[PDB]
Symmetry: C2
Subunit: 99 residues, 2 copies
């Protein structure tokens, strides 16, 4: 799809996140997804024109914006299968942008 | 040198015509851009996104589950004179700072 880059939310079992934890506890996971065509820049035009002509000393360059978090949630706490209290830092996104 | 350079600011002298902005100009600018490698597994958020995707929970949306080497700031303006002696000011043409986002 091509909905614009933004914050999305999904209710997930923490065992689905693959953190190494067995947990059937549900957490609200927030993430960044979507299209960045409206976010086109003159920088990206020039960079694409230079990569094509082999002017960038064979380095990997990103000439298109990426939809990514600009900020993260500080803490997500949950209990595991042994009822042990756990905290995870910067699990969910708090804000998104086409970078 | 042999090996992938880490994400950072790079500079290159270019004629404005080379940038393909729509105007021919032989004026040389120092173009600055972001290039290089980012460690793909530096984030618990990216690990979560990766596992959700492999288990087919995020279908149909464009999702970036690794950091991108991109500008975090741009140089304000770049001005130049074209072949018709017409003045142009281009905003945010060159990067000022880079990061793995």
């Amino acid at each position: 799809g091509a909905r614009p880059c933004g914050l999305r939310e999904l209710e997930v079992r923490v065992s689905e996140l693959g953190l190494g934890y067995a947990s059937d506890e549900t957490v609200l996971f927030r993430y960044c997804a979507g299209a960045c065509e409206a976010a086109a820049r003159v920088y990206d035009l020039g960079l694409r024109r230079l990569r094509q002509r082999r002017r960038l000393r064979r380095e990997r360059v990103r000439a298109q914006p990426c939809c990514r978090p600009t900020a993260y949630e500080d803490e997500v706490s949950f209990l595991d299968a042994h009822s042990r209290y756990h905290t995870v830092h910067e699990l969910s996104a708090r804000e998104c942008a086409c970078v």
